[PDB]
C-alpha cells in the first residue's frame, strides 16, 4: 500500500545503519567506502567530493554498488574499516587519500589574493566583522594591506595550547578562511596565495598536528567554504580570455625563412637530407620554445593597473592562467597548444 | 620475498637428497635438527629466485592454485599425491567458507588453532 | 490550501554562550525559507540600533604616528581595544567620558568616569596596554547612538560599530512534511556582541521589518 | 570577428560578459560572464534502466544463484578483483556473508530470512553445495572424491 | 537561464567549440527576441523587411 | 553519527579485537539479558556497544569476568 | 529546430527518407492528420491517371530502436508545392532539418559544488515547460496454441480471478484501444484446458456447487509487465488460416 | 594469497642498509622518506666516533628523521621483509605502519593483501616503446 | 526606527494588460535591496491561479492517436490548448466548454461563456479546423492551483474514476511568470537621500499587479509573524 507510516518507520531504521558503496572496476582499496545512508528524492546517488577520486569515476554515465551490512559484525566492521571517515591518508604512498582537488581549491585561492590595493586597502580591524566588511561592503578578498589582530594558538605547552594576539596584515579572504581553521596551526600557513599544493601542505600539517577529528571538521569546512566562495566568483570563460601573442606571427615567419635556408642548402647539396631535416627540426623546436615563452609572458602576471604609480604589473585574472597557477584544472602545456601552436605532435607511428 | 622460495640443496644433510625444498622449511629443518639433535646434519642449500608464471604452482593448499592456470595435470598431480589441502590459505578458507586467519577472524582461527592444539 | 503556508512550530534554540547561539525552525516553504533567511540577514545587519564608540581626543599627538609615553600601547592599539568595549546609552544621546588611573598597568573598564545612562557590559573589557610607570592620561572619548555600522574613514573617528552583535548566518536544511520532501528549514547560528539577548534582538528586528513593510500590505489580514 | 560585430548589431556585448544576480542571496555578481544558448541532446542511456534493486530472489536449479541483469528482477555478480579488495579490508564477516548470504545458500537462506525476521543476525556456514558438486564432478570423471576429516 | 554549466572543465579538453557555441547562441537568441519584439508592436511589413 | 573510529582502536590496539568486542556486546544486547551501561539515545545496539567499549567500561576481560560470575552464580 | 548547425540537415533528412517528398505534385488537394491528398496539375498529370497522390503517413509506428516515430504533416490546406517538396515532418525534424535536440539557454559559472566536474544544472524551469520529454512505444504479444490438454483460447474466462482485472478485457479477452495500464494487468487472456477429471466425488460436488470451471481451464492469460506501465497505443493479431475466432 | 603479519619481533640483526638514491645528475630520491617510517637494526649511530644516534629496535616516528639529516648519514641497516625472522610471512619488526594507521600494522595484517594491488595501481603506464664529464657542485 | 520612512505603493504604471512597471515610495537605507529581492522571490513563489486541469473530449479515446478533419494531434491539442488561461471567479473546479464545426481557423472565442470565467485573449489556438464536415466537441475542466502540479501528482486522486475519455495533463497554475527588482534613489531632498524601488511585473494578466503585490506582502507578513516568537 506504500504507507507514509512505513516511510517514517524506514527513516527511523535508515538512521542508525551505515551502508557500503563501490565503483565499477575495482583497482585500489579506495574503490569501496562506507558511509551514513541518507534518502534523496531522485533516481540517482548523491556523492560528496570526499571519496570522488578514490571512486575513480568521472561524473559521467556510470554506476555504483550498494552493500547492506546484515550481521551486526558487518556493520561494526564497515563503520570501523570500510567507513570512508577513516581512510584519510592513502595506504600506499602514505599521502592523504582525501586530497581536495575540486574548485574549492580555486575558491580558497580567490580568498588569499590582493590585486594592488582595493577599496579600503588601508583598513585595519580585528576580524570578526570582516565578514560584514566583505559581504556587506568595504572589503574584498582581493584586497591588500588589511591589518588585523590575529589570535593564533600554538600548542607549545606539553599537550596544551597557548593563544597569542598579533597585528598581521593580510587580505580579507585569508583572514576570513582563518576563522574556520582549527586552533593549532600558526597563521603563517594562512599567509599565502592558497595554491593546490599549499592546500595539500595544510592538510598534511594538520594531520601531523591535531588528529583525525578536527582534521575531518576542517576538511568538510574547507569543502563548504570553497563551494561557497568560488560560487561568489563565478569564474566564467570566453573567447577573449585567451589572448593571442602577436609575436608568434613574426617569430614563426622568421623560422619559415630558416626552413627555406635549410631548403636552399638541400638545393646546393651541401646539407644532407638527414642533416637538413635535423637542422629544420631544431629550428622549429627553438621557434616553438620562443613562441611558448612569448605566450606565457602575454599570459603571465603582465597587466598595468592604475594607482599612485599607475604602472602596477599584477597577477593576471584569466581563467586558464590562474587555474594552472593554483592548480585547479588544465595545463600550461594545454594552454600553449590552445593559444600558441599545438607543438610538433608528429608521429605516424614513431617518426617525426 | 614471494619470488624466492623452495630452495635447492646440494648436500642432503640427513633431510632429503632432492631439490626444491621450501627455503623456510629448509631453515626450519636445519634449526630443529642442527640445534636440537644433529648439528652434523647440514644440507648445503642454494637460493634461486622464481618467476611468477611458474611459481604460482608452488602452493600448500590443493584447492588453492587449482584453477591458477589449468587443473587437468594439476588435479592429476593432486590426486596422485593423495594430497590434502588442509584448509590453510586465504583462498582456502574463503572457497571452503572457513574463518580465515585474517582480520578479526585471525584470532578466531587462532582460537580455532587453539582448538586445533587441544583438539 | 490556495493561500495557506506552513508556519514553523519547532523553535528549539541552543545557546552556545551568552553571545553564541544557534536557533532552528520547523519547515519553511521551499525557497521561501531561503528568502526569509537572506532578508533576515540583510535587515538585521544593514540596520541594527545601539550605542557605540566613535571618536576620542586622547592626551598626546593628534597624529597616528605618536609616542607611547609609557602607556606601552600604540594609539591604534588603545583605540581598537576601546572599540572593544560595550557602551550602551540607556536614554542619553552622544555623551562624553574620560578616564585616568594610576600606573598599575591593568587597563580594565573600571577606570573611566561613571555615568548613569551609560552602561558597560564588560567590567574587564580591555582599553589600552599596561602602562610602564605611574603615568596617567586623559581619554576624552565620546559615545553616540546609531543603527547599523559606518566606516570611520568617511565619518569622524575610530569606527561606527552601532550594531551590538558579532556574527550571524542561516543554514537551509531539507526535510519532508509527511511524504513530500521539498521542505525547507532555516537554522540561524549567531554570536552576539553582548548585552543583547539574541531572542530579544530577533524579535526587535522582526518588529522593525514588519513595521517597515506594513504600509505595503494595504492593511492585509484585517480579520 | 563577424560574430562579435553582429553582437553590436544585435546591441549585445561583443565580449559577451554581462552582469549576474545570485538568486539565492541577491548579490550583484563579480566576474561579468558571457552567457548564451547552447544546444543539448538527450542520449539513449536514459534512467529508464538505471535504477535497480533486489531484496529476495530465486535460486537457480543448478548452482542456486541469483538471476542476473534485471532478468526477473535479476542481480549482478560480484567481482574477483573486488573479492581481493574485500580481503584487503580484512572484513571476515563481510566476505563470509557475501560467500554465504549473497550466494547459493538455500537452507541457509531460509534460516537467515527467519533470523532477520526474528532479529537474530546469524549466518550458518555449513559447506557450499558447489563444493559437493565439484567433488561429484571429480567422481563424475575418473577419480573418486573422498574428503578426510 | 535554466542551465548553469560546470566551467572548470574548460581547459582539460580544448573545448573552445563550446565557447563559440555560447557566443553564437547568445547572438541568435538576441536576434530572434528582437524580431519578436518588433512583432509585438505589430510593426510594418516594410520596416521588418528592412 | 560517530563518523571516525580512533578511540576504540587506541583502547584495543590490535584493531581486530575491538570490532570483535563491539559485535559480541551487540549480539548480547540484541538477544537480551544485558543492560547498556552508557545512556542510550534511541540508536542502534552497535553504536551503543561501541560507545560503551570506548568509554573505558567494556573490555575483553570485563565481559569475560561478568560472564564467569553469571555462570558461577547459577 | 537546431539553431546553429552545419548547413546539411536539409539534405540529411531529404535523402534519409524518414519524411515524404512530393513526387510529381503541383498543389495540395486534401490535408489530413492521417494522410495527405494532392491533386496533380494537368501539365505533369499523366494521361489516364488520377492526377492525385495519397501519402498516408503512419503515426506512432514502433520503429527499430523502440523509439516513437510519428511523421507529421507539413502543410495545413491548399498549399501549392512543386515536385519532391518536403511534405512530412519526421521524427526529430522540423520543416526539413535533423532536428535532434533542444536549444536551451545556459550561462557559464561554477556554483555551490552542484557543478563539480561534469554536471549540468537544470532548474525547475525546463521541468515546467517539460521540453525534452521522452516518447516511447513498446509492444507485447500472446499465442493461442491449441494444445493436447486442451486449446488455450482468448475467452476472458479466468476462474478464481478478481473481477477488477476483467474490467478492462473484452469478450475476445482483448483490451479496447485507449485504455490505461499499470502493474501486472491482464493483457491477452487464454485458458489452457487441463486433463479431464473422473467422477471424483469431491470434484463432482465442486462442479455441482460452483461449476463451469472444474479447474478444467488453467490460466493461460497474458499480463502487463512488472515495472512497465503505459497506455495501449495500437494492436494487431494474426491467426493460423482456418481459425476464425475474430471476436474483437 | 598467503602473505600476512604473524610475528612481532624478528630477533635478527640481519637487514639491508638504505641510502639516498644519488643517481644520474643528482639524488632522485633522498633517504629521508626511504626510511622515514622504518625501524632500524642496531646499526643506528651518530657520525661522531663512539657516538650513538639511536638504539637497536626503534621506528623513526618523526624526530629521528631531522636528527639524522643533521647527522649526514646515508645508509642505515634495518630489518626487512623475509629478513624478518618469522619462518612464515615476516615479523612485525620489519613491516612498519606505512598506512593511515599511525599505529603500527597489527598482528594478522595481510601486508601482501595490502601490497599486490599497490604495485599494479598505476594502470596508466606507457608502452609500445668517458669523454664528457661535468661536475654538479664542489 | 528613528523615522524609518517606510515605503508604500505609488506610481503604478501598467505597460500592458500583462506587462507592468510599478513603483513605490522611497524607503530607508538597506531595505531597498531586501525589499526588491524578497518581492521578486515571493511574487514568483506563490501566485494562485486557474488553469485547465483535466480534459474529457468526445472525439478521441487515446490522445496519442490521430483525428480526421482535425490538423494537429491530440497531444498537440493538449499542448496548444494548455495555452488556455482565464480569469476565474470565487467559484473553482469549473467546466467550460467549446464545440464547433466549419472550415475557418479555430479560435479560443468559440468556447461556452460561463458566468465565472473570462478569456483574456481570443487569439489562442484550438487546433484550427481543416474539413467542413468535421465537428470538434470538448469540455475543459479548470482548477485553481498555486503551482505546477505534475501529471502523476494528480494520479492518486482517481481510484475508480477517470474513464478512457477523461484524462489529465500538466500545468503551471501560477499567473505570475515575471517579478523583478530595480532599486534607485530619487525624490529625496527634505530628508536624507532615500531609495525607491521599481518592480517590473509581467503577470499572466489573471492577477492584478497591486492585488498580487498585496497578497504576496500578506503572505510574507504571515511568515514573519512567527519569527517574532
Secondary structure string (H, E, C) spanning chain C: CCCCCCCCCCCCEECCCCCEEEEECCCECCCHHHHHHHHHHHHHHHCCEEEEEEEECCCCCCCCCCCCCCCCCCHHHHHHHHHCCCEEECCCCCEEECECCCCCCCCCCCCECCCCCEEECCCCCCCCCCCCCCCCCCCCEEEEEEECCECCCCCCCCCECCCCEEEEEEEEEEECCCCCCCEEEEEEEEEECCCCCHHHHHHHHHHHHHHHHCCCCCCCCCC
F6 exposed, middle or buried (CB, 10 Å; 0-12, 13-18, 19+)? Answer: middle
Chain G residues inside the 8 Å CB shell of D35: 105-108
Say which of A36, A86, A211 has its CB closest to residue F5: A86
- Say what the resolution is, in angstroms: 6.6
CATH of the domain at B81: 1.10.150.390
The domain ranges of chain F are: 1-74
Asked if G106 and E29 come within 8 Å (Cβ–Cβ), the reply is no
Longest dimension (CA), chain A: 94
- Distance of alpha carbon C84 from alpha carbon A103, whole angstroms: 37
Task: Encode H38-62: b = buried (16+ Cβ within 10 Å), e = exposed.
Answer: bbbbebbbeeeeeeebbeebebbee
Alpha carbon of G117 to those of A26, A329, A332, G104, G111: distances in Å? 22, 10, 19, 20, 11
Asked if D20 and G107 come within 8 Å (Cβ–Cβ), the reply is yes
Residues 6+ apart with CB under 8 A from H84: H7, H10, H12, H90, H91, H92, H93, H94, H95
| A80 Cβ under 8 Å from any chain B Cβ | no
- Distance of alpha carbon G142 from alpha carbon G185, whole angstroms: 14
| G102 Cβ under 8 Å from any chain E Cβ | no
Cα angle I214, I220, I226 (rounded to 5 degrees) comes to 140
Q: How many helices (H) and strands (E) does chain E have?
A: 2, 1
- Distance of alpha carbon H95 from alpha carbon H100, whole angstroms: 14
| A77 Cβ under 8 Å from any chain B Cβ | yes
Alpha carbon of A34 to those of A65, B73, D135, F5: distances in Å? 11, 43, 38, 12
Determine contact, residues A45/A21, Cβ cutoff 8 Å: yes
Helix axes C32-46, I31-45, angle to 10 degrees: 170
Nearest C-alpha neighbor of E11 from the set F28, A334, D131, C65? A334
Asked if F19 and A73 come within 8 Å (Cβ–Cβ), the reply is yes
- The dotted CATH code for C2-49+163-221 is 3.30.1360.10
G and E touch per CB criterion (3+ pairs under 8 A)? yes
Q: Which chains have 3+ CB pairs within 8 A of E?
A: A, D, G
Cell numbers 594552454 correspond to A335
Chain B residues inside the 8 Å CB shell of D96: 97, 99, 105
Task: Encode D55-68: b = buried (16+ Cβ within 10 Å), e = exposed.
Answer: eeeebeeeebbbbe
The domain ranges of chain C are: 2-49+163-221, 50-162
* Beta strands in A185-290, from DSSP E residues, in sequence order: none
The residues facing C175 across adjacent strands are C183
Cell numbers 505595503 correspond to C216
Say which of G108, G109, G116 has its CB closest to residue A49: G116
* Class of domain I1-48+174-229 (CATH, top level): alpha beta
Superfamily classification of domain F1-74: RNA polymerase subunit, RPB6/omega (3.90.940.10)
| C38 Cβ under 8 Å from any chain A Cβ | no
- Distance of alpha carbon C152 from alpha carbon C159, whole angstroms: 4
Asked if D121 and A27 come within 8 Å (Cβ–Cβ), the reply is no
Q: How many helices (H) and strands (E) does chain A have?
A: 12, 8
Asked if D6 and E21 come within 8 Å (Cβ–Cβ), the reply is no
Chain B's closest residue to F17, CA to CA, is B104
E and A touch per CB criterion (3+ pairs under 8 A)? yes
| H106 Cβ under 8 Å from any chain F Cβ | yes
Cell numbers 545458500 correspond to D105
Alpha carbon of C16 to those of C21, C22, C196: distances in Å? 5, 7, 15
I and H touch per CB criterion (3+ pairs under 8 A)? no
Cell digits for A54? Answer: 578514490
Longest dimension (CA), chain D: 92
Asked if D26 and C38 come within 8 Å (Cβ–Cβ), the reply is yes
| G124 Cβ under 8 Å from any chain A Cβ | no
| G134 Cβ under 8 Å from any chain A Cβ | no
Chain A's closest residue to E22, CA to CA, is A238
Q: Is G206 left (phi over 0), alpha (psi -120 to 50) or beta?
A: alpha
Residues written for chain H? 138
- Distance of alpha carbon C24 from alpha carbon C175, whole angstroms: 13
Asked if A216 and F43 come within 8 Å (Cβ–Cβ), the reply is no
B and D touch per CB criterion (3+ pairs under 8 A)? yes
Asked if A238 and G116 come within 8 Å (Cβ–Cβ), the reply is no
Q: How many helices (H) and strands (E) does chain B have?
A: 5, 2
- Distance of alpha carbon B43 from alpha carbon B10, whole angstroms: 7
| H138 Cβ under 8 Å from any chain F Cβ | no
Q: What's the per-residue H, E or C state across chain F?
A: CCCCCCHHHHHHCCCCHHHHHHHHHHHHHHHCCCCCCCCCCCCCHHHHHHHHHHCCCCCCCHHHHHHHHHHHCC
| D95 Cβ under 8 Å from any chain A Cβ | no
Asked if F16 and H108 come within 8 Å (Cβ–Cβ), the reply is yes
Element (H, E) at G246: none
Element (H, E) at I118: strand I117-119
Alpha carbon of H79 to those of H34, H72, H102: distances in Å? 13, 21, 19
- Distance of alpha carbon A92 from alpha carbon A70, whole angstroms: 30
Chain D residues inside the 8 Å CB shell of A26: 79, 81-82, 84-85
Superfamily classification of domain C50-162: DNA-directed RNA polymerase, insert domain (2.170.120.12)
I160 exposed, middle or buried (CB, 10 Å; 0-12, 13-18, 19+)? Answer: exposed
List binding-site positions of H: 10, 84, 91, 94
Nearest C-alpha neighbor of C1 from the set I173, I39, I119, I201? I173
Determine contact, residues C103/C131, Cβ cutoff 8 Å: yes
| D142 Cβ under 8 Å from any chain I Cβ | no
Nearest C-alpha neighbor of G105 from the set G94, G85, G121? G121
Determine contact, residues D20/D29, Cβ cutoff 8 Å: yes
Phi and psi for G155 in degrees, rounded to 5? Answer: -120, -5
Cα angle B22, B24, B26 (rounded to 5 degrees) comes to 65
Work out the number of other CB atoms within 10 angstroms of the CB of residue D13.
17
- Distance of alpha carbon C140 from alpha carbon C8, whole angstroms: 49
| A235 Cβ under 8 Å from any chain G Cβ | yes
Q: Which chains have 3+ CB pairs within 8 A of B?
A: A, D, F, H
| D78 Cβ under 8 Å from any chain B Cβ | no
- Distance of alpha carbon A259 from alpha carbon H41, whole angstroms: 64
Determine contact, residues G98/G170, Cβ cutoff 8 Å: no
Within the 38-77 window of chain I, which residues sit less than 8 Å (CB to CB) from chain C?
38, 41-42, 45-46, 48
User: Coil, strand or helix: which one is A223?
Assistant: helix
| D85 Cβ under 8 Å from any chain B Cβ | no
Chain C residues inside the 8 Å CB shell of A132: 45, 149
3-state helix, strand, coil in chain G (%, to 5): 10, 20, 70
Chain H's closest residue to A350, CA to CA, is H129
Q: Which chains have 3+ CB pairs within 8 A of D?
A: A, B, C, E, F, G, H, I
Chain A residues inside the 8 Å CB shell of D31: 233-236
- Minimum distance, in Å, between the CA of residue G201 and any CA atom of chain I: 42
Instruction: Give the method of determination.
Output: cryo-EM
C30, C33, C35, C39, best to mutate vs chain D, most D CBs in 10 Å = C35
- Distance of alpha carbon C40 from alpha carbon I31, whole angstroms: 11
Asked if D87 and B105 come within 8 Å (Cβ–Cβ), the reply is no
Cα angle I134, I135, I140 (rounded to 5 degrees) comes to 140
Determine contact, residues B94/B100, Cβ cutoff 8 Å: yes
* Class of domain I49-173 (CATH, top level): mainly beta
Cell digits for I53? Answer: 486541469
- Minimum distance, in Å, between the CA of residue D93 and any CA atom of chain I: 44
- Minimum distance, in Å, between the CA of residue A124 and any CA atom of chain C: 9
Longest dimension (CA), chain I: 76
Residues 6+ apart with CB under 8 A from A254: A287
Nearest C-alpha neighbor of I64 from the set G230, G49, B100? G230
Determine contact, residues D95/D123, Cβ cutoff 8 Å: no
Q: What's the per-residue H, E or C state across chain H?
A: CCCCEEECCCCCCCCEEECCEEECCEEEECCCCCCCCCEECCCCCCCCCCCCCCCCCEECCCHHHHHHHHHCCCCEEECCCCCCCCCCCEEHHHCCCCCCCCCCCCCCCCHHHHCCCCCCCCCCCCCCCCCCCCCCCC
E and C touch per CB criterion (3+ pairs under 8 A)? no
CA atoms within 13 A on the CB side of H25: 1
Say which of D38, D44, D73 has its CB closest to residue G106: D38
- Distance of alpha carbon C157 from alpha carbon B73, whole angstroms: 96
Asked if E24 and D10 come within 8 Å (Cβ–Cβ), the reply is no
The residues facing I195 across adjacent strands are I27
- Minimum distance, in Å, between the CA of residue G99 and any CA atom of chain A: 24
- Distance of alpha carbon A34 from alpha carbon A78, whole angstroms: 6
Amino acid at each position: 500500500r506504500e504507507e507514509a507510516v512505513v516511510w517514517d518507520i524506514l527513516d527511523e531504521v535508515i538512521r542508525e545503519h551505515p551502508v557500503l558503496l563501490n565503483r565499477a572496476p575495482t583497482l585500489h582499496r579506495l574503490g569501496i567506502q562506507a558511509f551514513e545512508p541518507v534518502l534523496i528524492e531522485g533516481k540517482a546517488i548523491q556523492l560528496h567530493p570526499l571519496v570522488c577520486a578514490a571512486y575513480n569515476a568521472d561524473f559521467d554515465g556510470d554506476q555504483m554498488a550498494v552493500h547492506v551490512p546484515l550481521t551486526l559484525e558487518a556493520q561494526l566492521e564497515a563503520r570501523a574499516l570500510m567507513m570512508s571517515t577513516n581512510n584519510i591518508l592513502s595506504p600506499a604512498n602514505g599521502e592523504p587519500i582525501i586530497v581536495p582537488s575540486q574548485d574549492v581549491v580555486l575558491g580558497l585561492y580567490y580568498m588569499t589574493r590582493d590585486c594592488v590595493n582595493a577599496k579600503g586597502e588601508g583598513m585595519v580591524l580585528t576580524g570578526p566583522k570582516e565578514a560584514e566588511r566583505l559581504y556587506r561592503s568595504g572589503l574584498a578578498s582581493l584586497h591588500a594591506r588589511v591589518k588585523v589582530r590575529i589570535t593564533e594558538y600554538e600548542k607549545d605547552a606539553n599537550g596544551e595550547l597557548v593563544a597569542k594576539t598579533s597585528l598581521k596584515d593580510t587580505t580579507v579572504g585569508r583572514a576570513i578562511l582563518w576563522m574556520i581553521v582549527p586552533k593549532g596551526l600558526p597563521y603563517s600557513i594562512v599567509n599565502q596565495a592558497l595554491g593546490k599544493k599549499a592546500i595539500s601542505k595544510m592538510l598534511n600539517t594538520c594531520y601531523r598536528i591535531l588528529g583525525l577529528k578536527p582534521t575531518v571538521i576542517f576538511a568538510d569546512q574547507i569543502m563548504y567554504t570553497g563551494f561557497a566562495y568560488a560560487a561568489r566568483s563565478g569564474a566564467s570563460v570566453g573567447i577573449d580570455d585567451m589572448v593571442i601573442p602577436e609575436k608568434k606571427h613574426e617569430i614563426i615567419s622568421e623560422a619559415e625563412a630558416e626552413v627555406a635556408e635549410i631548403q636552399e642548402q638541400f638545393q646546393s647539396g651541401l646539407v644532407t637530407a638527414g642533416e637538413r631535416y635535423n637542422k629544420v627540426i631544431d629550428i622549429w623546436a627553438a621557434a616553438n620554445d620562443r613562441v611558448s615563452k612569448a605566450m606565457m609572458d602575454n599570459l603571465q602576471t603582465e597587466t598595468v593597473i592604475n594607482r599612485d604609480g599607475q604602472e602596477e604589473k599584477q597577477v593576471s585574472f584569466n581563467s586558464i592562467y590562474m587555474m594552472a597557477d593554483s592548480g585547479a584544472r588544465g595545463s600550461a602545456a594545454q594552454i600553449r597548444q590552445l593559444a600558441g601552436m599545438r607543438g610538433l605532435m608528429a608521429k605516424p607511428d614513431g617518426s617525426i | 620475498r614471494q619470488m624466492l622460495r623452495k630452495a635447492t640443496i646440494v648436500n642432503a644433510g640427513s633431510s632429503d637428497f632432492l631439490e626444491g625444498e621450501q627455503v623456510e622449511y629448509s631453515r626450519v629443518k636445519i634449526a630443529n635438527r642442527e640445534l636440537e639433535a644433529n648439528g652434523k646434519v647440514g644440507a648445503t642449500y642454494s637460493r634461486d629466485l622464481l618467476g611468477i608464471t611458474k611459481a604460482s604452482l608452488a602452493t600448500e593448499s590443493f584447492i588453492s592454485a587449482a584453477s591458477f592456470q589449468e587443473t587437468t595435470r594439476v588435479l592429476t598431480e593432486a590426486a596422485v599425491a593423495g594430497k590434502r589441502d588442509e584448509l590453510r590459505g586465504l583462498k582456502e578458507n574463503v572457497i571452503v567458507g572457513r574463518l580465515i586467519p585474517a582480520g578479526t577472524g585471525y584470532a578466531y582461527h587462532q582460537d580455532r588453532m587453539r582448538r586445533r592444539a587441544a583438539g | 490550501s490556495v493561500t495557506e503556508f506552513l508556519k514553523p512550530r519547532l523553535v528549539d534554540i541552543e545557546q552556545v554562550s551568552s553571545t553564541h547561539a544557534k536557533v532552528t525552525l520547523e519547515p519553511l516553504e521551499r525557497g521561501f525559507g531561503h528568502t526569509l533567511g537572506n532578508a533576515l540577514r540583510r535587515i538585521l545587519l544593514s540596520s541594527m540600533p545601539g550605542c557605540a564608540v566613535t571618536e576620542v581626543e586622547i592626551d598626546g599627538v593628534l597624529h597616528e604616528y605618536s609616542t607611547k609615553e609609557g602607556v606601552q600601547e600604540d594609539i591604534l592599539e588603545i583605540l581598537l581595544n576601546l572599540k572593544g568595549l560595550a557602551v550602551r546609552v540607556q536614554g542619553k544621546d552622544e555623551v562624553i567620558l574620560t578616564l585616568n588611573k594610576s600606573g598599575i598597568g591593568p587597563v580594565t573598564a573600571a577606570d573611566i568616569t561613571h555615568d548613569g545612562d551609560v552602561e558597560i557590559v564588560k567590567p574587564q573589557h580591555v582599553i589600552c596596554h599596561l602602562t610602564d610607570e605611574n603615568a596617567s592620561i586623559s581619554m576624552r572619548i565620546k559615545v553616540q547612538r546609531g543603527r547599523g555600522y559606518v566606516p570611520a574613514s568617511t565619518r569622524i573617528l575610530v569606527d561606527a560599530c552601532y550594531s551590538p552583535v558579532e556574527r550571524i548566518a542561516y543554514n537551509v536544511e531539507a526535510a519532508r512534511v509527511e511524504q513530500r520532501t521539498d521542505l525547507d528549514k532555516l537554522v540561524i547560528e549567531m554570536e552576539t556582541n553582548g548585552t543583547i539577548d539574541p531572542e530579544e534582538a530577533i524579535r526587535r528586528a522582526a518588529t522593525i521589518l514588519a513595521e517597515q513593510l506594513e504600509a505595503f500590505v494595504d492593511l492585509r489580514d484585517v480579520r | 570577428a563577424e560574430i562579435k560585430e553582429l553582437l553590436k548589431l544585435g546591441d549585445l556585448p561583443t565580449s559577451g560578459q554581462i552582469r549576474l544576480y545570485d538568486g539565492r542571496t541577491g548579490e550583484q555578481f563579480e566576474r561579468p560572464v558571457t552567457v548564451g544558448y547552447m544546444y543539448m541532446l538527450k542520449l539513449n542511456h536514459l534512467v529508464d534502466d538505471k535504477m535497480h534493486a533486489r531484496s529476495t530472489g530465486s535460486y537457480s536449479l543448478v548452482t542456486q544463484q541469483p538471476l542476473g541483469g534485471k532478468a526477473q528482477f535479476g542481480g549482478q555478480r560480484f567481482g574477483e578483483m573486488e573479492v581481493w579488495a574485500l580481503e584487503a579490508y580484512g572484513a571476515a564477516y563481510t566476505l563470509q556473508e557475501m560467500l554465504t548470504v549473497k550466494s547459493d545458500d538455500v537452507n541457509g537462506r531460509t534460516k537467515m530470512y527467519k533470523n532477520i525476521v526474528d532479529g537474530n543476525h546469524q549466518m550458518e556456514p555449513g559447506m557450499p553445495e558447489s563444493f559437493n558438486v565439484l567433488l561429484k564432478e571429480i567422481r563424475s570423471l575418473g577419480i573418486n572424491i573422498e574428503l578426510e576429516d | 537561464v535554466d542551465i548553469v554549466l560546470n566551467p572548470l572543465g574548460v581547459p582539460s579538453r580544448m573545448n573552445i567549440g563550446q565557447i563559440l557555441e555560447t557566443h553564437l547562441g547568445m547572438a541568435a537568441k538576441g536576434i530572434g527576441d528582437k524580431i519578436n519584439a518588433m512583432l509585438k508592436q505589430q510593426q510594418e511589413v516594410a520596416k521588418l523587411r528592412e | 553519527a560517530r563518523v571516525t573510529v580512533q578511540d576504540a582502536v587506541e583502547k584495543i590496539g590490535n584493531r581486530f579485537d575491538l570490532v570483535l568486542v563491539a559485535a559480541r556486546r551487540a549480539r548480547q544486547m540484541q538477544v537480551g539479558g544485558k543492560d547498556p551501561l552508557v545512556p542510550e539515545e534511541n540508536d542502534k545496539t552497535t553504536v551503543i556497544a561501541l560507545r560503551e567499549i570506548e568509554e573505558g567500561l567494556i573490555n575483553n576481560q570485563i565481559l569475560d569476568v561478568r560472564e564467569r560470575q553469571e555462570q558461577q552464580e547459577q | 529546430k537546431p539553431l546553429v548547425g552545419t548547413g546539411m540537415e536539409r539534405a540529411v533528412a531529404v535523402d534519409s527518407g524518414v519524411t515524404a517528398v512530393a513526387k510529381r505534385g503541383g498543389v495540395v488537394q486534401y490535408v489530413d492528420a492521417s494522410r495527405i491528398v494532392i491533386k496533380v496539375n494537368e501539365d505533369e498529370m499523366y494521361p489516364g491517371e488520377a492526377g492525385i497522390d495519397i501519402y498516408n503517413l503512419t503515426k506512432y509506428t514502433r520503429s527499430n530502436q523502440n523509439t516513437c516515430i510519428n511523421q507529421m504533416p507539413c502543410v495545413s490546406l491548399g498549399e501549392p508545392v512543386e515536385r519532391g517538396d518536403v511534405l512530412a515532418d519526421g521524427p526529430s525534424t522540423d520543416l526539413g532539418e535533423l532536428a535532434l535536440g533542444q536549444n536551451m539557454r545556459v550561462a557559464f559559472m561554477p556554483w555551490n559544488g552542484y557543478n563539480f566536474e561534469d554536471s549540468i544544472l537544470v532548474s525547475e524551469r525546463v521541468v515546467q515547460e517539460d521540453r525534452f520529454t521522452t516518447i516511447h512505444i513498446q509492444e507485447l504479444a500472446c499465442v493461442s496454441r491449441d494444445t493436447k490438454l486442451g486449446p488455450e483460447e482468448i475467452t476472458a474466462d479466468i476462474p478464481n480471478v478478481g473481477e477488477a482485472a476483467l474490467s478492462k478485457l473484452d469478450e475476445s479477452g482483448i483490451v479496447y484501444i485507449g485504455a490505461e495500464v499499470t502493474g501486472g494487468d491482464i493483457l491477452v487472456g487464454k485458458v489452457t484446458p487441463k486433463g479431464e477429471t473422473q467422477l471424483t466425488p469431491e470434484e463432482k460436488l465442486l462442479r455441482a456447487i460452483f461449476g463451469e470451471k472444474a479447474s478444467d481451464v488453467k490460466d493461460s492469460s497474458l499480463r502487463v509487465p512488472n515495472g512497465v506501465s503505459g497506455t495501449v497505443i495500437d494492436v494487431q493479431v494474426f491467426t493460423r488460416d482456418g481459425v476464425e475466432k475474430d471476436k474483437r | 594469497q598467503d602473505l600476512v603479519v604473524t610475528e612481532d619481533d624478528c630477533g635478527t640483526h640481519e637487514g639491508i642498509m638504505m641510502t639516498p638514491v644519488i643517481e644520474g645528475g643528482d639524488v632522485k630520491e633522498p633517504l629521508r622518506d626511504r626510511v622515514l617510517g622504518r625501524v632500524t637494526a642496531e646499526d643506528v649511530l651518530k657520525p661522531g666516533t663512539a657516538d650513538i644516534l639511536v638504539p637497536r629496535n626503534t621506528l623513526l616516528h618523526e624526530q629521528w628523521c631531522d636528527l639524522l639529516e643533521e647527522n649526514s648519514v646515508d645508509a642505515v641497516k634495518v630489518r626487512s621483509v623475509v629478513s624478518c625472522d618469522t619462518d612464515f610471512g615476516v615479523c612485525a619488526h620489519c613491516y612498519g605502519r606505512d598506512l593511515a594507521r599511525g599505529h603500527i600494522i597489527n598482528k594478522g595484517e595481510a601486508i601482501g593483501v595490502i601490497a599486490a594491488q599497490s604495485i599494479g595501481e598505476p594502470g596508466t603506464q606507457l608502452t609500445m616503446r668517458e669523454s664528457s664529464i661535468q661536475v654538479k657542485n664542489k
